[PDB]
Amino acid sequence: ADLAFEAKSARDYAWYDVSSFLTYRVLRTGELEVRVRFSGHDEWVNVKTSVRERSIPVEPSECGRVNVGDLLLCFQEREDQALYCDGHVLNIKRGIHDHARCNCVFLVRYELDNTEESLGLERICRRPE
Ligand SMILES: OC[C@H]1O[C@H](O[C@H]2[C@H](O)[C@@H](O)[C@H](OCCCCC3CCCCC3)O[C@@H]2CO)[C@H](O)[C@@H](O)[C@@H]1O
Ligand SMILES: [Zn+2]
Numbered sequence: 848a849d850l851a852f853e854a855k856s857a858r859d860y861a862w863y864d865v866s867s868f869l870t871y872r873v874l875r876t877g878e879l880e881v882r883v884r885f886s887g888h889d890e891w892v893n894v895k896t897s898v899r900e901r902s903i904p905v906e907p908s909e910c911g912r913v914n915v916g917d918l919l920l921c922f923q924e925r926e927d928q929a930l931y932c933d934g935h936v937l938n939i940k941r942g943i944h945d946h947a948r949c950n951c952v953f954l955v956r957y958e959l960d961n962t963e964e965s966l967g968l969e970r971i972c973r974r975p976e
Contacts, residue, residue: 853920854883855897856890860959861930862920864901902972907949910968915939921955922970931972933958 852865866886871894873879880891881898892898902920905913913919913936921934934955942950949968956963 851901852898853901854881854885854890854892856892857897859930861932862902863931865898900975902974905949905968905971905973906946907944907968908946910949910951913939913953913968913971913973918974919953919955920972920974921957921964921966923957923964924970934964937963 853862854865855862864886866884869882869884869889871879871881872891879894881894883890883892883898915936915938917936919934919936920931923930923932923934934957936953937956938954940952942952944950951968953966953968953971954963955966955971
């Protein structure tokens with residue numbers, strides 16, 4: 848299977864699945880940027896910093912491969928809005944569960960503002976590798 852990607856947006860700092868790439872441009876400065884179309888509107892995003900390989904769901908049977916200090920894309924639901932953004936695992940309370948669903952609790956620290964939330968596996972994706 849081929850590489851899929853996600854891009855970070857300058858509007859909200861959240862990551863969105865990239866559908867396709869349209870063109871590119873070089874800045875006076877030398878930074879390279881890329882015009883990205885999102886799946887589901889259109890943006891210039893820095894290649895080095897704001898585009899990476901798509902995060903990957905964790906299945907309950909493999910919840911053990913998530914550790915502290917791991918970087919994860921987290922579904923951060925609030926008021927109304929819901930953003931997928933980066934946080935790091937600070938701590939894990941492992942639960943008693945089978946392959947069907949994971950009741951482990953992952954305390955994450957969101958990178959942007961250092962706020963803290965407790966998430967289920969269902970609201971986190973790991974990074975490749
Ligand atoms: O590249 C900058 C940093 O992040 C990397 O991940 C990112 C990396 O940033 C970025 O350059 C690289 O961009 C690849 C973006 C894909 C460009 C687009 C692809 C479809 C059509 C061709 C053009 O993606 C890496 C993942 O392949 C690496 O994880 C990191 O080591 C590296 O320093
Ligand atoms: Zn688990």
